Amino acid sequence: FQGTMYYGFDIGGTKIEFGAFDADLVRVARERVATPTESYAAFLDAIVTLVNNADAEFGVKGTVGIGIPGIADVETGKLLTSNIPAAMGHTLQRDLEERLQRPVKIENDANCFALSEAWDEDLRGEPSVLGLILGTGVGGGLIFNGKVHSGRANIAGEIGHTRLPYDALKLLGMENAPIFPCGCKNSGCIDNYLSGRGFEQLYDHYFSEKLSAPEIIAHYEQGERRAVQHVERFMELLAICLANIFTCLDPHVVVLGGGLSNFELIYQELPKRLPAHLLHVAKLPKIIKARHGDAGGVRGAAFLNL
Amino acid sequence: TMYYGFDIGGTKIEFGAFDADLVRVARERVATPTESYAAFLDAIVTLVNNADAEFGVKGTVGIGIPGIADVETGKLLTSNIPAAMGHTLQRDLEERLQRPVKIENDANCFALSEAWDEDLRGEPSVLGLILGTGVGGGLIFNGKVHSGRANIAGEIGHTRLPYDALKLLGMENAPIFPCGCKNSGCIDNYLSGRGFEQLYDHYFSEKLSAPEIIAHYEQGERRAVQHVERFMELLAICLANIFTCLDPHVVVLGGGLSNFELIYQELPKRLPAHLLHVAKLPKIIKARHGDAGGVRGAAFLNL
Ligand SMILES: CC(=O)N[C@@H]1[C@@H](O)[C@H](O)[C@@H](COP(=O)(O)O)O[C@H]1O
Ligand SMILES: CC(=O)N[C@@H]1[C@@H](O)[C@H](O)[C@@H](COP(=O)(O)O)O[C@H]1O
Ligand SMILES: [Cl-]
Ligand SMILES: [K+]
Ligand SMILES: [K+]
Ligand SMILES: [Zn+2]
Ligand SMILES: [Zn+2]
Ligand SMILES: [Zn+2]
Ligand SMILES: [Zn+2]
């Protein structure tokens, strides 16, 4: 008999990342199916397919932990997923507990990322860890003394739904700054600026060409003028926004995840640009790239059931 | 054992002595001597010696300061006390008083003492907010203060106005106030009792005190009513941003402006529009130890 198997899902806009971990926490399955962002019955279908297929492959009933890009209402279980309008308002935990006939744990994706990153031996004893996801949206997971702070209403770490601070707006032209609409239905949330999507939207606003983030970064590496101006602006915008956040939270370690965390220039430029925007006595946190690559979410979700 | 706590203020120095059972047995209140650093130091030193002489012992010394002691050098950054800026307070006092001294941020001390109240025992998180000469925060998670990598945790006063607050204040026409930290537009200069006054004076060109403006508001005077409506909305917008980041279970307000009772009625009404749809309000309460939370938290550093 296989024993206990822990399944984790990291749900994104585009793909559902699935992982199965055995009794020793060795990853023994890895799947990536398309995220159905049309039907909700189909979104459920994808999740449900993955668990049953894995059930049949190892011949067990795995536990199910799910990391979602949003929040499950603490009273109703209904989802708020700002960059997934498909899933908005659904009782995901109950609906999956129905279809799968077992308990399901649901947590925010950045919380799961921060939890798994902070449980690494090098970080487990740090007094605080901030996990930041820069993907389709901007999300945070807050760990204090090794325990996730999920907040009054599962909102802790929702830095993506804070508005651009004055010094960022000044950088972007003040009354001429682009004010992007947000999936939360507010406007000017940093979710729409510091994410990989926001990086792209800012380029398009200033330069009127809809390039992807990888394309803009390749142009930057060739020293192309528009991309260089964009990247300079973006690095300063990211430093200003993070300096504000760090003046509030003052984390010991910041771990970055999501697609835009692979832009290596970030780790060189933040330490240079942050000091101007921090208090005189501030000391920089250690700012590091995710140590589990793109798997932090899957692992943290699986490990909810530990 | 006698435990001394000092809460050092923009305006005044609060002193308290707690006996072995933690009963408050001394209370003194001197003005904060913010002209000279010699005079600042002297006041603290006077209060310890006087209390030493009165109870005939050498009590422990915990101090809550409106600022940060550099984690590496011990030098102070006190944005609204230019007198103390740059000084090695802990070592200077340990010299003059010939015993160890603990130094912590004033809002940290306030939050710690408020969070250890029986009513708040077991809350997963507490945010203590000081709205005084400046704006300060103390973050408590599972009963323990998070002081941060460099003793900056909870420095929400030195975050800049968010876009929705600037829009409320006129965007490119919004007043951008200079800050004691040497940045500009920090909320320290807007949501504090001082900032409340500076916003009134910017819009109405009269330098009234916060109590005077509030009294005029209570009479229904037009300028004060406009100001208070603007202020309440500004406070809700700024705190909604902060609560979307921190999502605290309980928010305890302290400092002079926490006595403006309208705040407890208006925040719950005005916060929801600016929070996420699934946000639930934190319990928003007035300090349960009145003006003593800082003194008690400071004293109890040495517990
Ligand atoms: C209220 C909300 O929906 N906030 C979400 C936040 O919960 C989430 O952690 C963050 C990052 O997620 P992503 O993997 O890029 O899709 O995206 C924000 O927009
Ligand atoms: C960098 C700094 O000086 N920040 C301070 C902060 O540490 C402090 O908690 C806050 C409140 O203090 P107050 O009782 O009004 O005099 O005032 C802010 O200005
Ligand atoms: Cl004060
Ligand atoms: K989060
Ligand atoms: K603080
Ligand atoms: Zn938003
Ligand atoms: Zn190209
Ligand atoms: Zn400041
Ligand atoms: Zn008057």
Residue from A122, A200, A164 nearest B161 by CA: A164
Give the three-state DSSP class for A258: coil
Residue A58 marked as a ligand binder: no
Q: In degrees rounded to 5, what are phi and psi of residue B18? A: -120, 135
The span from the CA of A132 to the CA of A130, in Å, is 6
- The answer to the question of residue B223 being in a domain is yes
Residue from A100, A114, A204 nearest A151 by CA: A114
Give the three-state DSSP class for B300: helix
End-to-end CA distance of chain B: 10
Please name the amino acid found at residue A206.
Y
* Residue of B7, B8, B80, B89 to test ligand 2 pocket, by largest number of atoms within 8 Å of CB: B80
Here the CATH number for the domain that contains residue A219 is 3.30.420.40
Q: How far is A108 from chain B (nearest CA, A)?
A: 13
Number of Cβ within 10 Å of residue B194's Cβ equals: 22
The span from the CA of A115 to the CA of A301, in Å, is 9
The span from the CA of A212 to the CA of A138, in Å, is 17
Give the three-state DSSP class for B250: strand
CA-to-CA dists, residue A94 to A44, A80, A106, angstroms: 11, 15, 10
The span from the CA of B181 to the CA of B189, in Å, is 11
Looking up tokens 């915990």, which residue turns up? B62
Residue from A62, A205, A244 nearest B162 by CA: A244
Whether residues A166 and B164 touch (CB distance < 8 A) is answered with: no
For residues A280 and A299, membership in a common domain is answered with no
- Report whether A46 contacts A11 (CB < 8 A): no
Please tell me the distance between residue A270's alpha carbon and the centre of ligand 5 in angstroms: 24
Taking contacts as CB-CB distances below 8 angstroms, the residues of chain B near A161 are 244, 276
Query: B170 pairs with which residues across the strands?
Result: none
Residue B30 CB contacts under 8 Å (≥ 6 apart), including other chains: B12, B13, B15, B43, B46, B47
The span from the CA of B197 to the CA of B124, in Å, is 35
Residue B174 CB contacts under 8 Å (≥ 6 apart), including other chains: B161, B166
Structure tokens given for B61: 């010394």
- The answer to the question of residue B134 being in a domain is yes
Query: A256 pairs with which residues across the strands?
Result: A132, A289
The span from the CA of B299 to the CA of B7, in Å, is 9
- Report whether A102 contacts A54 (CB < 8 A): no
Whether residues A152 and B70 touch (CB distance < 8 A) is answered with: no
Residue B254 marked as a ligand binder: no
Number of Cβ within 10 Å of residue A38's Cβ equals: 9
For residues A56 and A167, membership in a common domain is answered with no
Number of Cβ within 10 Å of residue A66's Cβ equals: 26
Which of A138, A147, A148, A149 is most worth mutating to test chain B (most B CB atoms within 10 A of its CB)?
A149
Beta strands at B3-8 and B12-18: parallel, antiparallel or unpaired: antiparallel
The span from the CA of B126 to the CA of B116, in Å, is 10
Determine the residue of chain B that is closest to A242 in CA distance. Answer: B159
Cα angle for residues B255, B259, B264 (degrees, 5° grid): 110
Whether residues A140 and B245 touch (CB distance < 8 A) is answered with: yes
Q: In degrees rounded to 5, what are phi and psi of residue B49? A: -70, -45
- Report whether A78 contacts A89 (CB < 8 A): yes
Provide the number of structural domains found in chain A.
2
Report CA A214 to chain centroid distance, whole Å: 18
The span from the CA of B5 to the CA of B30, in Å, is 14
Structure tokens given for A232: 């300079």
Residues B136, B188, B160, A187, CA torsion sign: positive
The span from the CA of B207 to the CA of B219, in Å, is 18
Residues B47, B188, B287, B219, CA torsion sign: positive
For residues B236 and B276, membership in a common domain is answered with yes
Q: Whose CA is nearest to atom 18 of ligand 2?
A: B134
For residues A266 and A136, membership in a common domain is answered with yes
Which of A130, A154, A159, A247 is most worth mutating to test chain B (most B CB atoms within 10 A of its CB)?
A247
Residue from A88, A6, A73 nearest A43 by CA: A88
- The answer to the question of residue A1 being in a domain is no
- The H or E element containing residue A209 is none
For residues A82 and A12, membership in a common domain is answered with yes
Let me know if A33 is exposed, middle or buried by CB neighbors in 10 A (0-12, 13-18, 19+). Answer: middle
The span from the CA of B65 to the CA of B136, in Å, is 11
Method used to obtain the model: X-ray
Number of Cβ within 10 Å of residue B100's Cβ equals: 12
Let me know if A94 is exposed, middle or buried by CB neighbors in 10 A (0-12, 13-18, 19+). Answer: middle
Q: In terms of DSSP H, where are the helices of A130-222? A: 166-172, 196-207, 213-221
Let me know if B204 is exposed, middle or buried by CB neighbors in 10 A (0-12, 13-18, 19+). Answer: middle
Residue B63 marked as a ligand binder: no
Residue from B246, B266, B242 nearest B164 by CA: B242
For residues A108 and A221, membership in a common domain is answered with no
For residues B148 and B215, membership in a common domain is answered with yes
Give the three-state DSSP class for B8: strand
- The answer to the question of residue A108 being in a domain is yes
For residues A94 and A241, membership in a common domain is answered with no
Q: In terms of DSSP H, where are the helices of chain B? A: 37-55, 89-97, 106-115, 163-169, 193-204, 210-218, 222-246, 262-270, 293-299
Angle between helices B193-204 and B210-218 (to 10 degrees): 70
- Report whether B125 contacts B145 (CB < 8 A): no
Please tell me the distance between residue A285's alpha carbon and the centre of ligand 5 in angstroms: 17
Number of Cβ within 10 Å of residue B45's Cβ equals: 15
Half-sphere exposure of B280 (CA within 13 A, CB side): 14
Give the three-state DSSP class for A138: strand
The span from the CA of A67 to the CA of A104, in Å, is 11
Check if A257 has its Cβ closer than 6 Å to any atom of ligand 1.
no
For residues A85 and A161, membership in a common domain is answered with no
Give the three-state DSSP class for B3: strand
CA of B134, nearest ligand number: 2
Tell how many helices (H) and how many strands (E) occur in chain A: 9, 12
Query: Domain of B33?
Result: 3-109+291-302
The span from the CA of B73 to the CA of B96, in Å, is 19
Beta strands in A43-127 (DSSP E): 63-68, 71-72, 79-80, 104-108
Residue from B128, B179, B132, B121 nearest B153 by CA: B128
Let me know if B127 is exposed, middle or buried by CB neighbors in 10 A (0-12, 13-18, 19+). Answer: buried
Residue from A131, A151, A86 nearest A296 by CA: A131
Give the three-state DSSP class for B109: helix
Residue A131 CB contacts under 8 Å (≥ 6 apart), including other chains: A110, A111, A113, A114, A115, A117, A118, A140, A141, A143, A157, A254, A255, A257, A296
Whether residues A279 and B158 touch (CB distance < 8 A) is answered with: yes
- Report whether B4 contacts B301 (CB < 8 A): no
- The H or E element containing residue B24 is strand B24-31
Tell me which residue in A80, A127, A247 faces B158 most closely, judged by beta carbons.
A247
The span from the CA of B52 to the CA of B42, in Å, is 15
Query: A71 pairs with which residues across the strands?
Result: A80
CA of A215, nearest ligand number: 7
CA-to-CA dists, residue A168 to A133, A173, A282, B178, B202, angstroms: 19, 9, 20, 16, 23
Give the three-state DSSP class for A66: strand
- The answer to the question of residue A118 being in a domain is no
- The answer to the question of residue A72 being in a domain is yes
End-to-end CA distance of chain A: 19
The span from the CA of B189 to the CA of B193, in Å, is 9
Q: In degrees rounded to 5, what are phi and psi of residue A133? A: -100, 125
For residues A268 and A136, membership in a common domain is answered with yes
Whether residues B245 and A244 touch (CB distance < 8 A) is answered with: no
- Report whether B93 contacts B61 (CB < 8 A): yes
What DSSP designation does B229 have? H
- The answer to the question of residue A117 being in a domain is no
Rg value, chain B, Cα: 19
CA-to-CA dists, residue B302 to B2, B25, B59, B67, B109, angstroms: 10, 17, 10, 20, 12
For residues A52 and A189, membership in a common domain is answered with no
Residue A141 marked as a ligand binder: yes
Give the three-state DSSP class for B6: strand
CA-to-CA dists, residue A80 to A8, A152, A155, angstroms: 20, 15, 10
The span from the CA of A287 to the CA of B129, in Å, is 28
Rg value, chain A, Cα: 20
For residues A92 and A146, membership in a common domain is answered with no
For the CA of B157, the nearest atom of ligand 2:
18
The span from the CA of A293 to the CA of A290, in Å, is 5
Q: In what order do the strands lie in the sheet with B250-254?
A: B144-145, B135-141, B125-131, B250-254, B283-286
Angle between helices A196-207 and A225-249 (to 10 degrees): 130
Q: In degrees rounded to 5, what are phi and psi of residue B266? A: -80, -35
Structure tokens given for B65: 């300061």
The span from the CA of A107 to the CA of A51, in Å, is 18
